[PDB]
Amino acid sequence: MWAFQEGVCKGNLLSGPTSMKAPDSAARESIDRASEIMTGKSYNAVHTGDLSKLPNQGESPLRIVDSDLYSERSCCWVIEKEGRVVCKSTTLTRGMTSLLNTTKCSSPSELICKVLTVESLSEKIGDTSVEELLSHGRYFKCALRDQERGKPKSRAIFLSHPFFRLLSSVVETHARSVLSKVSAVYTATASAEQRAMMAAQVVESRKHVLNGDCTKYNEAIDADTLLKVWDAIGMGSIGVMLAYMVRRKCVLIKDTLVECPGGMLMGMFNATATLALQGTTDRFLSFSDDFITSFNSPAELREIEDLLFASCHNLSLKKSYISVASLEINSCTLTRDGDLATGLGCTAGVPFRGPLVTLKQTAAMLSGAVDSGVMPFHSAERLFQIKQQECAYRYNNPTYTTRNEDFLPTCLGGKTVISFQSLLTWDCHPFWYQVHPDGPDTIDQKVLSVLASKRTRLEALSDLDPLVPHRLLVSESDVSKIRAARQAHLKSLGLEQPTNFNYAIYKAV
């Protein structure tokens, strides 16, 4: 049916693929591709472009954001029981805490300063040294990549050591700053539509467009290229250490360590990889492996191909095409004048995940579609009515409801089929407010959140004064004192636990 669409359709209506296939095969093939590229027989991994038009941020203070150093994402922790390296998977928060415990350090900034300040690689920084840190930071673990539409085969992501993550965070922050400075496209966070509009404006002055993709992007960005870019932007010893760890990286597949000297593992240094091409030439609008450019004559196209080759941005011959009447970037398709291309485009269907979550999500999707030119409003209203009918067929059993109120949705025992326009313009019973995309959370969302939320934990450090930074050092006594002071102040007001604060109600009055 996607083949018989009048306009552009990516076939995103159904959910993405699923699989529990182990990631060992994907990682093994990725490492084999990297090894093949290293021997210079498949693609190019040697950077030749001149990265001289890049500002040198050598004097910029080393800025570390601690928010991204702690998270629930998985990471690899390395131990040396009897001289043999053992790799375990643990939350990034636990990994960072273990790293800080091994080398006594109040915060990651102190660890970075100590690492950069020692006078030798064997000097102790606690129960470790820079040599040991570098040796342990080259170990990675394989995991299954998140499923995405259009990729039936499972892909592999790689979890790194906390030290590697810290250095990567620093270099990536500075590389993103340089990228934002070099061009206005990467201001802070450009969505697909914003990038598409900017590209349409940029490439309007030429005839042909070169909607293109880079193949084997992660396997072709060598440690040499990363070090070259980092030196160009002035990364100092941090860049050298990171390049050394990348060159010596080892991946634990199943139960064996395999060497992968070639390329990088996954999209870790996206900013640096983009900066390679961007500093090579001001002719492309590239976001990692996705780029777009325009040309007028075959000689210009040959120059573009040579520029891409010299920047280790090997063109993907399978899914790169030349267009004259359309532009395409990050799945967003636009007309040369800037208008969104007619058709469904990237519209995605809403799977059944609850009586009211489904309605809220389909309402949000239809609002997004109608706000653009995807479909007229009447079509969206008909689709909303159809979805309400489907939800009624699916959720109108006693196991979900025992009510027969007139105002209730047909799927919860009622006999109300709210018009899409009536729902959007707050013209319904208050029970329907939760179904509005901007309305409060639905009953299903709260129930599922409670289910998810249902260890010898520490003393909770919530309800903090907004004026205290999160980088302040606190001991056990400090936490207890803060809790006691907050409780005493709340009691002085004759009040229980603090009342929830919502910005909308505060602005209303």
Next chain:
Amino acid sequence: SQFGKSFKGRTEVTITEYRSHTVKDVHRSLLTADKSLRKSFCFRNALNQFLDKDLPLLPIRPKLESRVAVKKSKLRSQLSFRPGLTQEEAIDLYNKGYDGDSVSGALQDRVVNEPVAYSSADNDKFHRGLAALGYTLAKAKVTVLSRSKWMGYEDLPQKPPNGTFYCRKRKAMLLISC
């Protein structure tokens, strides 16, 4: 003495790390959303409770009526800018007993960019989803340190040269810099 085990070997840790160690991880349920909602009639009980108790206390909102003629145009990014709170009212809100985390979140400005291809004569901003129909949206740096009496602090005089004092007109500690 969990502090001595989670942070073994360190007596002081940053607030970020300590809070990261109290996130209360959420476990990925192995069942679908439908089966989870059916389990123990949790959703049915929640719906009964909401209808009986929560629904009557809902602050009924007004219905949108303002409309303007619109015509299809190029794709644009409609920008909604919600300002964040400032130090003064943030301190006041925290002192009054509101949750500190919520106020901390509200101190950050919010920017919403929405792709819309629809324009009006006056270039009005439209509501969520209602773009086709045309529903429109329309010296001394005295600093308040706190709204409480800190013990053993000098009272604010007529001409506070540069110190920190207490104000009687407004129940707050004032820092008079410069």
Next chain:
Amino acid sequence: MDSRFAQLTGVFCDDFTYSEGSRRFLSSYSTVERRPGVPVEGDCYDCLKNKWIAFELEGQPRKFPKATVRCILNNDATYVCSEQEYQQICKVQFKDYLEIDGVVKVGHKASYDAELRERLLELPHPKSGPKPRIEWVAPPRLADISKETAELKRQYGFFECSKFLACGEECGLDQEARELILNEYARDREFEFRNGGWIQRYTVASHKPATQKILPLPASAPLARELLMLIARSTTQAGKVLHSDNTSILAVPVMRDSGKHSKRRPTASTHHLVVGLSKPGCEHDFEFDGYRAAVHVMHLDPKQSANIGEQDFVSTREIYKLDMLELPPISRKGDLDRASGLETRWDVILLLECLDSTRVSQAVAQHFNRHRLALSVCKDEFRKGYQLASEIRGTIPLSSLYYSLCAVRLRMTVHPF
């Protein structure tokens, strides 16, 4: 005590009074303000609170007594202090950004930089590699798509029946007959019976993929929504016959036969065998008490079942129909047939897309979108984007890929672009 903070201390307390006129903070770096006859325990002394204040850079602790209050100046122009008051004073006072020596900079060079660079140099480096010769030609034509479809068909062939895809049509039996047939089929396969439920026990695996072939298209899929809802219900209700308005299925857990002490209940990872009924007249016919029906099985992964059971067939069909061209009639093998073909078979194709958990049709659709938007493509390379057989394995995904290619061929044949 460090001499790099002297100036920083001076600006920290310009003219700040504490009692009536006297300056609140005494700077230890100035003799006139320094307190004689007492050991110095910090950068500055506060007389109201009788405390010592020390300034440190980010991650650079100084040697001062624990009693001394430390005010950290972060690299992002943000200050921290255990005492809110001193934090505010420093925040307002240090607006004039004055760089302090010792601040760590991203360009910092460690004493081991040369050694690490030498180690990197001694390590292996990549070779250049060949420059591709790119030829830009017109996109593939109908002939190339027909060639790809014919290659797939001759390489894999067709099944005699539609297998589980026939379960989207009525089997011609009532609820009682359907339940009896399913239960008697489960008994015939010698499935274990326990706690009123069926369990399929296995001991050894051949460790080879099952035979792959293309499924012929049934005439229509009237019971697509019913079947998908039944699978969604069976995600957890396994071992007993599930009934719908017009059809039934039986999802039996697949468990290892360890021995006398064996697994007795399903767990999160336990696979299912979904057994469904369709009209008889194929190899998989089953008869009991005069009731005859074709019994077709599908081995489903729990993630596969969860993904399949959540699809919205009707809404997807309507969204596709919003801006669709005229769908032609097609034959059992996805070939244009204006004489005896049926337009309802397209519904079946959609149902197949819902049943295929790898969604290779999504990849085919993305490539076809590129094809329709392309003026020129790389010769002999773009055409190798519809060859997705290596990316998938199984009868259902193979059939889905074949019929996606057939849909592309039909679009090019009937509505050329």
Next chain:
RNA sequence: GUGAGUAAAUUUGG
């Protein structure tokens, strides 16, 4: 490697 039992997915979706 040996032995034994059989909290969690059925309760409750036409």
Next chain:
RNA sequence: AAAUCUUUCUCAC
């Protein structure tokens, strides 16, 4: 047995 290294429950020693 199948969309085939997946269908791998608990306890004690």
